[PDB]
Amino acid sequence: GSPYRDLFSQRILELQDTGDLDVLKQKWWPHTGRCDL
């Protein structure tokens, strides 16, 4: 009994259609080399 999960997942694929998922990764965990990759 929770209608908003589509409303959740509506943005989710949109975030998957951006890659802002990975942008939100980069703050708490950037993708580059810890020392040099």
Binding site: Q10, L13, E14, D17
Partner: protein, 50 residues
């Protein structure tokens, strides 16, 4: 149907060509049949868009 114990029926699409957002503000193929809502289930390679 073999692990849940209920039944099924099968249609065929009149277009059958990865149905598209028409110029009619509408969907053809397999897509709009469930948007005109005149079948029940569609089981295919569905590249989901939001």
């Amino acid at each position: 149907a073999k692990a849940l114990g209920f039944k099924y029926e099968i249609y065929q699409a009149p277009d059958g060509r990865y149905g598209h957002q028409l110029h009619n503000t509408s969907w053809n193929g397999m897509i709009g049949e469930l948007i005109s809502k005149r079948a029940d289930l569609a089981i295919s390679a569905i590249t989901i868009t939001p």
